[PDB]
Design a binder for this molecule. Structure first.
Ligand code: GDP
Ligand code: CL
Ligand code: CL
Ligand code: CL
Length: 331
């Protein structure tokens, strides 16, 4: 954005400070959205992209988290089979299912051995297990279940070291409000992941692939309600409201087989990625009560995709530079 460079070059407030050219222009960014919408993943991406990121030794720290998530995923599927009354493809997998629970049951924390890897591999290749997997909207299953289970052989190797993508795919139970700092285009970002005064911008995350998920309340509806409060809150009048319609990769896969009408019974468009995503975007943007005063800046994201997040965050920063710089202090 040549317009961004020009816009920021119009500022003169550094001149009022003795060492103004060395001062830090600060941007305060609130990262919001329902649980599992992708907030932590965006935080990790900011570290990877703008701060070098996740070194091998750092990645190693996530090994047992990867194991934990993998064990949780397969157990979720196996348990759901009993509830949905889905039989194993090969009755022999029943012994493996039992063994899964024996091994997870006796251990202290996530782990992986050859024996466990074999049990999980055989379960995951079984046709009943796959049929239950494909009905995951009917229970609660980690988004990254397939990612880890399909790569089990690599993850189970004795000298396994998690990759960045392995780390980005983890589900980690975070609580409270976490602040991270990073500098990009010479802006000093202060990012708060809320699981606020002077907020320059809000990035609001939505899991697109929640549309067909729940117990007796639709997860997308809840995200809408939450965006509604936020977008029209008086405190955020001058705040740039950025909307990340996230998990577009998972959404693209689901929409082929699971109709949007599950979420919006009135939807009468085609069940294609293009029409259904557009419709969701319109549903969210329509919650904006001040359409003549405030614009929503919407992006379709895959938060685990570093190149996608770098591209999007670049566009978001140019919007901030063009609209909000005058409200950003020097420190
Ligand atoms: N496939 C896919 N997985 C994602 C995406 N965004 C987040 N995830 C995964 O979804 C899970 C929940 O994301 P997380 O960042 O922890 O959500 P948070 O509760 O808002 O902090 C994690 O396992 C992430 O790796 C996405 O765009 N695509
Ligand atoms: Cl069973
Ligand atoms: Cl072993
Ligand atoms: Cl991209």
């Amino acid at each position: 954005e040549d317009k961004a460079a020009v816009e920021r070059s119009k500022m003169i407030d550094r001149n009022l400070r003795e060492d103004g050219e060395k001062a830090a222009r600060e941007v305060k960014l609130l990262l919001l959205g329902a649980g599992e919408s992708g907030k932590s993943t965006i935080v990790k991406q900011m570290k990877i992209i703008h701060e070098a990121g996740y070194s091998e030794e750092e990645c190693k720290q996530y090994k047992a988290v990867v194991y934990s998530n993998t064990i949780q995923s397969i157990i979720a599927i196996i348990r759901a089979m009993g509830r949905l009354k889905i039989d194993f493809g090969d009755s022999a997998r029943a012994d493996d299912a039992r063994q899964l629970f024996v091994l997870a049951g006796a251990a202290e924390e996530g782990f992986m051995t050859a024996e466990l890897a074999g049990v999980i591999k055989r379960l995951w290749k079984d046709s009943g297990v796959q049929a239950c997997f494909n009905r995951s909207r009917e229970y609660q299953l980690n988004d990254s279940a397939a990612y880890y289970l399909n790569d089990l052989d690599r993850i189970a190797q004795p000298n396994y070291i998690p990759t960045q993508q392995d780390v980005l795919r983890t589900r980690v139970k975070t609580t409270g409000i976490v602040e991270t700092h990073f500098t990009f285009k010479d802006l000093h970002f202060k990012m708060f992941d809320v699981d606020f005064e002077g907020v320059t911008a809000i990035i609001f995350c939505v899991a697109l692939s929640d549309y067909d998920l729940v117990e007796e309340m639709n997860r997308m509806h809840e995200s809408m309600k939450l965006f509604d409060s936020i977008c029209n809150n008086k405190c955020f009048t001058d705040t740039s409201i950025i909307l990340f319609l996230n998990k577009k990769d998972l959404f693209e896969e689901k929409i082929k087989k699971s109709p949007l009408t599950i979420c919006y019974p009135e939807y009468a468009g085609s069940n294609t990625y293009e029409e259904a995503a557009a419709y969701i975007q319109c549903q969210f943007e329509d919650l904006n009560k001040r359409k003549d005063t405030k614009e929503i800046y919407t992006h379709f994201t895959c938060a685990t995709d570093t190149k996608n997040v770098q591209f999007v965050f670049d566009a978001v920063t140019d919007v901030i530079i063009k609209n909000n710089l005058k409200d950003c202090g020097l420190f």
